[PDB]
């Protein structure tokens, strides 16, 4: 009668509900596509756990949370937001009606602040625990304590097959329940030579499959919105240049995508139409698209990671693990015996790719985690029950940065500023910038700038209209500052009644601005609860630069020459990006602060503001 009956989870329903009734903690193991995320909440609902309180399901990815909530509301024939809802960083889609709530790890973590026993919940499913996301690890540590205080709470840990076997031991020998899998052998093809231009080669491989191969959808693994949009654009360009090719529906998947773009990936195309899904590793384990027969794997993910040449974080593409590569290839083995095209050699796979991914807790900036856990009451991270504890090096770096920011006092204790920063689901320096903007008389402007820094870049630079795009970008430039340029673009977008037609005409991403407005509206509410006044600096934009100079003092740099600056904290060379508004100035300024470092050909500053030297002196 129902599509949801073809799912492997449906057959173990009774056996699994028996294991859950008998044990506080259960580990559920099954392949991506088993029905773990869509079906487990419904099993618990139908078995009466929703009587006493809410059934929560946490996972690392925003798009998975939003999308599965929609699917489950449809399966259950309820309005999304009613019996089935979701909560993500910048959207609460729930009501007093909500019994099944899908959320991101971060949202449940923040709920434990004011509700340490998570009293509203009868059950929690910690889904996609095999990714070992930072906040997943923080939640397992929290649950170790909660499960003592509360003997009624059911914890279900969900895992794909790999990196699944340590959860049981961590929760005192919790029972494991495996949903058996059905996977076709996948033909894994390695590139003959190393790939320079993985975007170009991805597109060549997409169109070779499209014109030559029998029916079956394509899944392309890229790294971010940026290489995804370029890939989609180049597929359309080359497709339109071919002679009478079959139709192709090209659909992106990236973390910040709006709900309307998410819904598109699950639509069946007209008959005779192939789909090409161009995704990040969202499409590795977190969600399934029916009918995939061909995978194209770039071999990379994009992460903010410690860079030795910099002595600080850099946003960079980095090789995946051999485990990630197996998972990516496996997406072409669900419908029939598919193919996986790896844009990298067997040699590169054996020598340049680690067997496993290191847990995020051991390779990521810990500043949000330190600040969060000090709120929750935890003085030192190594006091916390981490499955894999973070290294002292990274703890020390965060303790230092949070002290320099003013979030910790000289004894390393939480300050009032540090507490206020925890109210904002963003990098501590970015929260500090928003908090300080009240005293600088520019909270109105700063919440706009912070909103623009929280969403994908606004400037559209299509590849067959680059001089026209560059020209339009230059008329929005405030040459002293990329931060003011973003404020300028948003203010002009608003002045034109938030028009999508205006954005296209000026080479701006409406989705970016629409997302910036979503974030702004949520930040305004947090600012209200934190009793911040909304004040405008009027025509004095200099005080915005001075405030930015205060929030990003730790990333001040001095001109070296020919677009090169020296980071004052580390004495490392960083390059100004040629796209920077600062190239509209008569000459490059002596002093800047920047938002972040990006690795492309070399280490570039991204989002740069000119600062007066006397501003830096005043500060510490
Ligand atoms: N928005 C959605 N998010 C995730 N899966 C979805 C969504 N809509 C439909 N599905 C379908 O649900 C099925 C997989 O069930 P799911 O519970 O996601 O499994 P698992 O969590 O075990 O991977 C696939 O047919 C997939 O396309
Ligand atoms: Mg899932």
Author numbering: 302 to 921
What text comes from the article?
The protein studied in this work is pre-mRNA-splicing factor 16 (Prp16) and is required for the transition of the spliceosome from the C to the C* state. Therefore, Prp16 binds the 3′-end sequence of the intron RNA and translocates towards the spliceosome, leading to dissociation of the branching factors Yju2 and Cwc25 and thereby enabling exon ligation. Prp16 belongs to the DEAH-box proteins, which share a highly conserved helicase core formed by two RecA-like domains.
The spliceosomal DEAH-box helicase Prp16 from the thermo­philic ascomycete C. thermophilum (ctPrp16) was crystallized in complex with ADP to mimic a post-catalytic state. An N- and C-terminally truncated construct ctPrp16 (302–920) was used for crystallization, as the removed parts are expected to be mainly disordered according to the PredictProtein server. The magnesium ion is hexavalently coordinated by four water molecules, Thr342 located within motif I and the β-phosphate of the ADP molecule. The adenine moiety does not form any polar contacts with ctPrp16 residues, but the adenine interacts with Phe567 via π–π stacking. However, this conformation appears to be an artifact caused by interaction with a symmetry mate within the crystal lattice.
